[PDB]
Design a binder for these strands. Structure first.
Ligand SMILES: O=c1ccn([C@@H]2O[C@H](COP(=O)(O)OP(=O)(O)OP(=O)(O)O)[C@@H](O)[C@H]2O)c(=O)[nH]1
Ligand SMILES: [Mg+2]
Ligand SMILES: [Mg+2]
Lengths: 147, 147, 142, 49, 49, 49, 1254, 49
RNA sequence: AUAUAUAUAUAUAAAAUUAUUUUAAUAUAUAUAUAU
RNA sequence: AUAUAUAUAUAUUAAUAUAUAUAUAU
RNA sequence: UUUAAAAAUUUUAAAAUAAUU
């Protein structure tokens, strides 16, 4: 099961739902201005601005993604054993996931792939800020070596 | 410590200063409005009493008297217990310990209020030096009168 | 624990009961052991005090605050007499330098109202705690 | 009472002569054990007078 | 019984105690308004006379 | 009001719920300070009309 | 007419007219038994109700839709409810019930679920499963009572037939309206009528042991059982509590609106706060006067010592200043159509402007009118609604504030900018100080902590077994044992000889499910953790305990509630002071790994490291693990047993928990569910919750408050508060006292702003504080306003009894305990004393006979505590309920009547030529046998539970079981060496003085039995109890117990009324006012409880701690038998060794035993005289000390003299004085000793022979 | 007390008469207490002034 | 592949605080006294 | 005739669900 | 010369009733 499947099956999909998050900020007026207000002229965004953004990103993840996943993973469990991926253990914990929960990790710098790959929804900067938000929604625990 | 500003003012108008005659006259009037009643002056003493209790760092507990008395040795085969008699007659009736603060607040008013000790506190129609429970009454009155 | 596997001594508080159980008769024969005892502290504190002798440069064993007569002795009492006796026996085995002045001021506190002595100021009056002392600057001139 | 005073005096008199071996232990055997344990020890003694 | 049994808290520092026990009663200003009442009382008495 | 607004803007600029460098409610007594409002004109009279 | 013609003598007897007697009692009980439900509803038909009880009933209550549209089926084959409004509508709906029933064979108008539907559902059909789930759940909702409602209604008619009563104190008949103004009875009768219709059978369903049979009528629904239970409760409360009939109407209206809605329990749950929100939380917007208590809290606040200092008058400045409760209350009232009721309450409340008895009675009446039903729903709905909640963590700990891993744990960097650092510091210091104590390193403490959780209650041993099976490890089964199967004793016996690395795989095993309903709250949930999971969670609970008891020290756990917790509310609600009520919503679901458990585990893993460097904890090895906390270094570092356990516990907490749900109400639901909610079955639960509560509040006030608020007022308010002087918490709930300064009550806007700061503080790390600031106290379900406790009568439903399963109830005589509990619950709530006593008389007959019959004489009920009325030709209503229960109570009520008691005997025949010292010449020995006094007195003392006999298991397997259990208990060589040395020393010295000296080898022989009696009783034991009761009834008795005989030699004298101990104008408990004469006089002349006087001779020789398997009785008797005979001290030391104590510790205990001469333990063990339950609220301590005088009134007598070496006798004398004084109605009086027949020395010798014979 | 001392103290039993006796004895003390004598809850015009 | 009757076996429901009540023959026999 | 206590003696150990096998019918 | 203070311990392990988290 792809990692994006549980978020793609929504009328406004999840990433589209979070792209409209710049309205809650005090003033941004556009997604590019959001990516500029968050991290400065490299990655490692401003922690305070990232926190102000996370306080808005969180209710989208607790009230929409968790209820949708709680049904999607049940429907998937009904039709056989499947190997499912996710972006954070909190996704599989809040949505009450059954099975073995294996955290994992890769020996590379994953943040650079978010600039290498091109044809993704929203700018590459938005994909990267989204990855930061998932990493901030992560409930620190040992990822333990994908191999 | 209160603070006042130090700079060119704006010419306030705070009319709060009056002579001594204008104050003694009102004192005479409000003392004339209080003579002989005793239901007009009791609540003032009660209010000052509760204020004294709230401002004072003093506590009251009869456990001090209990522990002090418990160290004297009394015979088990007797008919009179000096330590056990004062402990009995040293518990106030209707369990009110207010009379202390009320007497302490009556010091501010001896021209219109005279705090006397109640007739019930005396030895009930003549004492007798041959009576232990009746000798503790003299002890209590002697300690309590000077206040 | 090393002193445990080594030492031949072994404590027997029944000696106290044997000695006290031959008095005919507030009862002095029922104060130290049967009453005034922590009930959970066995005698590891003893050999911890013994092991503290080797390390008076970094560690300074002192008598706990909770083993004093609780704000005044009042020698008229009996439990406080026993408390004084036990503190006076236990103090010499510690390693802090102010054990003697604490042993003196325990009785000085207990005998307030009966006997008086001149102190150094009005902060460390005779009615202080014996444990509030323990700096060499706080030993009374008297 | 005089009875209580006599009882206290007698208790003190007997406690003065209780048959305990901890003092002679402390003066005869305890320092020997401390000296025997001191060498074989991870953190050597550190004393001031 | 009040005279015989008294007690202070064990953490009593007098200045620190009174510094915040006495503060809340000097933050209200009813005493200053109790003077204009006396002004008007004296004015009324003199006007009647 | 302007001190309060400056404190709030400072809190927003430093991205905190409460600004650390505050311009209002300092320890100083500044009850005589003024500013330029639209209440008074150039003659010194009020600006009701 | 009918009830009168049946039992007029009984009406006369219990109504204080005719002297009571056993014959009228048993005849009335006959009338109760031989009596039918049609007779009940006909008797209800005889009542000519007035217009006052009239009321418009909604007709929609009867025509209801079908159940099919309310349910559906999940993608996981789970039948679950379809919510129509909100995610709360998951309770039983209101639907028809007739189309699913098949006619019962005997009673052709009643029936249960058709077997066709059940079988078709068992086959696997959709509609059949849905219908059977609906039927079973409706039955379970209708089974939540303790007996058939018609029996309670009959008892009510019995009691009320007598009419009004005469007050011996007020000298007048009380004005309580008769049954013709009782609109609950009217609604009950009208609903039963309109449902029955033309059918002859009148009961709409008959409650039975197995299940309920529904009356087959088209006008039937599933809401009727709870509605009828509500109406019965309201009727009984109005008749025995004097509720005014103007608020019972509103209660009945709300119950009707509930029964007319979609679902009943859901409406009652959404509408549970209309009476409190409009009466208690809105009182006194305008004060004019009244008195409130003046308590003063003593200085070392942490110990909870108080002192009452009189009543201070109230004034206008103390009026209510909390924020208004108007807009929200009217919004709630409008959303559900209850706007007229809300407006009526909001109007009637604004007319009380004086803190008075009448206003507190108004609040009590307004709050007794809320329904007291046990809410019920399917288990698969509880598990799917509760366990899906997850924390809402708005400011998580940054990922760059965790070091590398050390096994399963990461450490907080010391330079963290978060707020979790203070949490980490608190738990770290607590763990270090806990582990530093030398007590936690002996085998005895290890063994005590091991045996703490080995109980006879389930622990889901199955999944443990089948998880150990998955790694090819065997386990004994012990085939043929009469012991229960699902018990932690069974698990422990299995897991004796197993290394930790084998059983450690069973730490990740799942847990079974438990359920339990409540009043006005969703059905509880439970999870029992197995033995390994309870073992590995030891450091967590130990550190939580150390925090609760030493470091933070702001809690009421471990303290007596009625001596320390009641006057806390009395102090925190008095007017100058104020109270804020803080609660954490969903506390279990808010404690997870991402904020709390990770920090706590790192803290407990680091703090223990210093003083446990290589040692094993409770049977856990000293494992190793590599760490990476330091950058650039990666080295394997040894750890301890207490750290190995934290490793395993962390790898359990990280994944969450998996619950195996299998409900017996829906066929086809046995799924498994996985949550992150913290369990509610762990030993460490209730302590860590309160530790976290206190820690977060203190870090609040010390750090987070001053760094986010700017106004000087809130800063000065948060700086003057500390958790130890202004905060009290226990588990979830909490309380924050705010003292009043000299200017009066603290300002309201500042307190509000602090409250919203607390609300913002909770959201940063997950918690959701439910804060309530409105001028009333709240703690552990105790309400207070202006220092007046207000009992919540809706929380104690008279008829309600809870049944979270389908198992049948315990057979009679098991219900008499519940009836006595009903009486006592009525006692503690201050009901009208005459009315409540009479109703309890009428109710203790209906539950007295049942099938070759066996009947209780009334004397048994008088022995259990129920106070008499008119026995022996005395005055009506002389005895109060404060008379204790048992021998003391019997002596108390006898000695007050003894002269008349004997002259009546002599006046009807009973005469003999034997001058008894007690009763003179009358022959009590014949009459009391005739009057059935001895019979009841000795039948009451017989147990009413089937004593589970051993079923004679095989010798081989039983020996193996007990041996493996003992091996589990004494696991390390040190305990075994201690006990073996003790046995050797005993056989050297103590051989002969005792034959079976108790040790740590008899613990398994008690765990084995405790596993036995957890099973079900057998018909043999039931018949045995029945025959034993019949035998004990059919003897001929010659005297009371020896203790009561010795008691009856003492006489007393009622001399003087003691001075008042509280003002007669100060309300201290709502409902206890001059209208309630006897409780008022007792309270005002004895005074409330504010002291600590526990343990009136609970002395014992064994002052140490051992395993929970052992008993204090055996060791105490052994030490007493070894100390009275005067054996060598080596015998005492050998006993204390083989009871599992250290050498030095056992010898210190031997010295203890040698002190404290044994004349007191012997009496304490021979006599059983304790303070009864009802005296807990009064000040009995000063009554013992000062107001029961052993020197009689006119001096010495030569009879009351007591020898110098018999001091224990003064204790029993003070007993008898206090009991005889408290039994009589009116005010408590000074009682003096009068005369002891025989003499002081003779009575002392009588007690002394008994003390010696041990 | 007259009627009670009439009645042969050894042969006393409970009675409404005894209840009334104790109640009157009890309420006399509360009536004669001085704070109870001089006290009130509601303010008068003069005290409010 | 199934249905019914029978017999056997198995699984399931917790922790804590508070207060009250109960937990040294199992039985018989001989000699002693007493009560009914 | 019964019971209580005294000394001794003796024996003595204390609801829903599922699985399996038998039988009868299809 | 006679009398007398007597110990206020615990956290008491389990089974039933009631209150609560
Ligand atoms: O059925 C449970 C009820 C609670 N208690 C224990 O009390 C603690 C808290 O109990 P709860 O977590 O159930 O209270 P709550 O959140 O439902 O409060 P509200 O939202 O209704 O306001 C838990 O730790 C649990 O162990 C259990 O012993 N029994
Ligand atoms: Mg709740
Ligand atoms: Mg709760």
């Amino acid at each position: 099961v792809d990692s994006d499947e549980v978020g793609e099956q929504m009328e406004p999909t999840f990433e589209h739902a979070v792209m409209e998050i710049y309205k809650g900020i005090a003033g941004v007026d556009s997604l590019d201005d959001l990516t500029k207000w968050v991290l400065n002229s490299d990655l490692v965004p401003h922690d305070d601005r990232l926190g102000q953004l996370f306080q808005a990103f969180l209710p989208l993840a607790k009230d929409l993604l968790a209820p949708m996943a709680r049904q999607f993973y049940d429907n998937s469990m009904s039709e056989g054993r499947l190997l499912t991926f996710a972006h954070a253990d909190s996704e599989l914990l809040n949505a009450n996931y059954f099975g073995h929960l294996l955290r994992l990790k890769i020996p590379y710098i994953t943040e650079v792939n978010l600039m290498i790959r091109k044809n993704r929804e929203g700018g590459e900067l938005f994909q990267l800020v989204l990855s930061y938000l998932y990493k901030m929604y992560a409930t620190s625990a040992q990822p333990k070596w994908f191999g | 410590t209160v603070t006042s500003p130090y700079a060119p003012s704006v010419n306030r108008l705070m009319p709060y200063r009056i002579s001594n005659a204008e104050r003694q006259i009102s004192q005479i009037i409000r003392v004339m409005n209080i003579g002989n009643n005793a239901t007009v002056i009791q609540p003032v003493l009660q209010d000052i009493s509760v204020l004294l209790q709230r401002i004072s760092p003093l506590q009251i507990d009869p456990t001090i008297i209990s522990n002090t008395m418990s160290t004297v040795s009394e015979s088990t085969t007797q008919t009179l217990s000096p330590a056990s008699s004062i402990l009995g007659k040293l518990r106030p009736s209707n369990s009110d310990f207010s009379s202390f603060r009320v007497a302490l607040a009556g010091w501010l008013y001896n021209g219109v209020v005279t705090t006397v000790i109640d007739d019930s506190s005396y030895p009930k129609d003549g004492g007798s030096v041959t009576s232990l429970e009746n000798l503790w009454d003299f002890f209590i009155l002697a300690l309590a009168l000077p206040l | 624990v090393l002193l445990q596997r080594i030492s031949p001594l072994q404590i027997d508080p029944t000696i106290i009961s044997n000695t006290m159980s031959t008095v005919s008769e507030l009862s002095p024969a029922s104060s130290i052991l049967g009453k005034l005892r922590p009930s959970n502290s066995d005698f590891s504190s003893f050999r911890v005090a013994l092991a503290g002798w080797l390390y008076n440069g970094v560690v300074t064993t002192v008598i706990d605050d909770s083993s004093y007569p609780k704000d005044g002795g009042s020698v008229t009492s009996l439990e406080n007499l026993w408390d004084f006796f036990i503190l006076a026996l236990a103090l010499p085995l510690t390693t802090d330098p102010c054990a003697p002045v604490k042993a003196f001021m325990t009785l000085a506190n207990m005998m307030v109202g009966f006997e008086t002595i001149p102190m150094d100021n009005q902060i460390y009056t005779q009615s202080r705690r014996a444990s509030a002392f323990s700096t060499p600057h706080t030993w009374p001139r008297c | 009472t005089q009875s209580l005073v006599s009882s206290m005096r007698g208790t003190l008199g007997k406690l003065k002569l209780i048959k305990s071996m901890t003092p002679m232990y402390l003066q005869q055997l305890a320092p020997v054990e401390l000296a025997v344990i001191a060498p074989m020890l991870p953190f050597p003694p550190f004393q001031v007078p | 019984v009040a005279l015989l049994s008294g007690k202070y808290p064990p953490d009593l520092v007098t200045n620190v105690w009174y510094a915040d026990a006495i503060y809340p009663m000097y933050a209200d200003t009813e005493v200053f308004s109790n003077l204009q009442r006396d002004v008007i009382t004296c004015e009324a008495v003199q006007t009647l006379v | 009001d302007e001190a309060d607004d400056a404190t709030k803007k400072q809190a927003k600029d430093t991205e905190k719920a409460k600004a650390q460098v505050t311009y209002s409610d300092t320890g100083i007594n500044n009850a005589n300070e003024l500013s330029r409002s639209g209440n008074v004109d150039n003659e010194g009279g009020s600006n009701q009309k | 007419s009918m009830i009168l013609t049946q039992f007029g003598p009984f009406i006369e007897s219990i109504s204080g007219i005719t002297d009571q007697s056993n014959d009228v009692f048993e005849n009335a009980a006959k009338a109760f038994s031989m009596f039918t439900r049609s007779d009940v509803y006909k008797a209800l038909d005889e009542i000519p109700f007035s217009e006052d009880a009239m009321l418009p009933i909604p007709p929609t209550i009867y025509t209801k839709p079908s159940h099919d549209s309310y349910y559906y089926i999940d993608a996981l084959n789970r039948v679950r409810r379809k919510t129509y409004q909100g995610p709360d509508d998951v309770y039983v709906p209101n639907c028809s019930i007739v189309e699913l029933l098949e006619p019962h064979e005997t009673l052709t108008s009643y029936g249960r679920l058709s077997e066709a539907i059940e079988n078709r559902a068992k086959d696997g059909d959709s509609q059949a499963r849905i219908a059977t789930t609906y039927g079973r759940i409706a039955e379970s909702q209708a089974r939540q009572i303790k007996a058939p409602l018609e029996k309670f209604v009959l008892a009510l008619l019995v009691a009320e037939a007598g009419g009004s009563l005469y007050d011996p104190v007020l000298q007048k008949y009380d004005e309580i309206p008769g049954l013709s103004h009782n609109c609950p009875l009217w609604c009950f009768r009208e609903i039963c009528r309109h449902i029955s219709g033309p059918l002859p059978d009148r009961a709409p369903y008959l409650y039975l042991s197995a299940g309920v049979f529904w009356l087959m009528s088209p006008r039937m629904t599933s809401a009727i059982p709870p509605l009828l239970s509500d109406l019965v409760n309201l009727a009984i409360l109005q008749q025995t509590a004097g509720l005014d009939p103007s608020l019972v109407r509103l209660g009945v209206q709300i119950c009707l609106h509930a029964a007319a809605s979609s679902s009943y329990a859901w409406f009652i749950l959404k509408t549970k706060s209309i009476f409190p929100q409009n009466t208690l939380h809105s009182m006194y917007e305008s004060l004019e006067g009244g008195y409130c208590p003046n308590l003063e809290w003593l200085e070392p606040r942490s110990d909870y010592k108080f002192m009452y200092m009189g009543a201070m008058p109230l004034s206008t400045k103390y009026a209510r200043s909390a924020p208004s409760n108007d807009k929200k209350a009217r919004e709630l009232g409008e959303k559900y159509g209850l706007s007229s009721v809300v407006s009526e309450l909001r109007r009637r409340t604004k007319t009380y402007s004086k803190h008075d008895f009448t206003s507190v009675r108004y609040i009590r009446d307004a709050m007794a009118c809320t329904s007291g039903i046990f809410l019920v729903r399917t288990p698969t709905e509880t598990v799917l609604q509760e366990y899906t909640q997850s924390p809402e963590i708005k400011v998580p700990i940054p990922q760059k504030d965790w070091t590398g891993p050390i096994g399963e744990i990461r450490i907080l960097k010391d330079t963290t900018s978060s707020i979790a650092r203070y949490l980490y510091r608190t738990w770290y210091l607590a763990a270090a100080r806990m582990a530093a104590q030398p007590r936690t390193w002996d085998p005895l403490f290890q063994a005590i902590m091991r045996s703490q959780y080995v109980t006879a209650r389930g622990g889901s041993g199955a999944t443990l077994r089948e998880s150990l099976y998955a790694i090819n490890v065997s386990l004994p089964d012990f085939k043929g044992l009469p012991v229960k199967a699902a018990t932690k004793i069974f698990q422990a016996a299995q897991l004796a000889n197993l290394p930790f690395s084998h059983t450690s795989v069973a730490i990740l095993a799942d847990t079974s499910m438990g359920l339990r309903n409540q009043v006005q709250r969703r059905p509880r949930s439970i999870m029992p953790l197995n033995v390994p999971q309870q073992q590995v969670s030891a450091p967590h609970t130990l550190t939580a305990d150390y925090i609760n008891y030493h470091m933070n020290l702001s809690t009421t756990s471990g303290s007596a509630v009625i001596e320390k917790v009641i006057p806390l509310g009395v102090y925190a609600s008095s007017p100058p002071n104020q109270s804020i009520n803080i609660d954490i919503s969903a506390c279990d679901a808010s404690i997870t790994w991402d904020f709390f458990l990770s920090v706590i585990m790192a803290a407990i893993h680091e703090g223990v490291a210093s003083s446990s460097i290589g040692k094993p904890f409770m049977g856990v090895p000293a494992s190793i693990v590599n760490d990476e906390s330091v950058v650039g270094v990666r080295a394997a570092r040894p750890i301890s047993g207490m750290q190995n356990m934290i490793q395993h516990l962390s790898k359990l907490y990280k994944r969450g928990f998996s619950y195996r749900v299998n409900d017996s109400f829906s066929p086809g639901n046995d799924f498994t569910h996985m949550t992150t909610t913290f369990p509610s079955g762990s030993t460490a639960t209730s302590t860590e919750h309160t530790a976290n509560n206190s820690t977060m509040m203190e870090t609040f006030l010390t750090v987070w408050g001053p760094e986010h608020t700017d106004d000087p007022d809130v800063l000065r308010l948060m700086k003057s508060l500390t958790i130890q002087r202004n905060y009290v918490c226990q588990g979830d709930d909490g309380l924050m006292i705010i003292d009043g300064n000299t200017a009066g009550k603290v300002n309201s806007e500042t307190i509000q702003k602090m409250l919203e700061l607390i609300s913002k503080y909770g959201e940063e790390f997950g918690w959701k504080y439910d804060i309530a600031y409105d001028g009333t106290a709240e703690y552990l379900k105790l309400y207070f306003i202006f220092g007046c406790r207000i009992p919540n009568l809706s929380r104690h439903p008279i008829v309600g009894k809870e049944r979270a399963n389908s198992s049948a109830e315990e057979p009679w005589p098991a219900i008499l305990d519940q009836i006595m509990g009903i009486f006592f619950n009525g006692v503690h709530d201050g009901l009208q004393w005459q009315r409540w006593i009479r109703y309890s008389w009428a109710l203790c007959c209906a539950f007295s006979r049942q099938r070759g019959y066996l009947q209780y004489p009334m004397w048994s009920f008088v022995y259990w505590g129920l106070p008499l009325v008119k026995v022996f030709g005395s005055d009506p209503w002389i005895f109060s309920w404060y008379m204790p229960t048992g021998d003391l109570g019997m002596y108390s009520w006898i000695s007050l009547i003894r002269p008349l008691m004997t002259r009546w005997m002599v006046a009807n025949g009973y005469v003999t030529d034997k001058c008894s010292p007690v009763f003179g010449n009358a022959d009590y020995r014949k009459c009391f046998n005739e009057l059935k006094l001895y019979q009841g007195y000795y039948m009451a003392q017989l147990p009413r539970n089937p004593k589970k006999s051993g079923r004679a298991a095989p010798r081989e397997v039983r020996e193996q079981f007990t041996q493996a259990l003992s091996d589990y208990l004494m696991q390390n060589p040190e305990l075994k060496s201690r006990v073996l040395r003790g046995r050797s020393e005993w056989e050297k010295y103590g051989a002969g003085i005792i034959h079976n000296p108790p040790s740590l080898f008899d613990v398994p022989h008690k765990w084995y039995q405790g596993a036995q009696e957890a099973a079900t009783a057998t018909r043999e034991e039931l018949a045995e109890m029945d025959e034993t009761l019949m035998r004990a009834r059919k003897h001929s008795y010659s005297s009371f117990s020896k203790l009561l005989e010795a008691y009856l030699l003492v006489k007393w004298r009622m001399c003087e009324a003691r001075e008042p101990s509280v003002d007669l104008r100060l309300p201290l408990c709502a409902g206890i006012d001059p209208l309630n004469s006897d409780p008022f006089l007792k309270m005002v002349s004895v005074g409330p409880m504010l002291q600590s006087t526990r343990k009136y001779f609970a002395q014992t020789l064994f002052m140490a701690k051992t395993v929970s398997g052992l008993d204090v009785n055996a060791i105490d008797s052994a030490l007493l038998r070894l100390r009275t005979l005067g054996a060598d001290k080596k015998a005492l030391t050998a006993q204390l060794l083989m009871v599992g104590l250290q050498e030095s510790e056992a010898d210190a205990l031997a010295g203890k035993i040698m002190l404290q001469d044994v004349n007191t333990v012997q009496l304490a063990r021979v006599v059983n005289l304790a303070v009864p339950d009802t005296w807990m609220s009064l000040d009995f301590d000063t009554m013992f000390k000062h107001h029961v005088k052993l020197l009689p009134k006119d001096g010495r007598h030569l009879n009351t003299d007591i020898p110098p070496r018999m001091g224990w006798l003064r204790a029993i004398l003070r007993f008898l004085g206090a009991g005889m004084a408290m039994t009589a109605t009116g005010v408590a009086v000074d009682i003096y000793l009068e005369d002891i027949h025989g003499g002081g020395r003779s009575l002392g010798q009588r007690f002394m022979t008994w003390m010696r014979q041990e | 007390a007259h009627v009670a001392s009439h009645g042969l103290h050894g042969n006393m039993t409970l009675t409404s008469s005894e209840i009334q006796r104790h109640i009157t004895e009890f309420i006399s003390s509360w009536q004669n207490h001085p704070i109870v004598q001089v006290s009130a809850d509601v303010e008068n015009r003069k005290t409010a002034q």
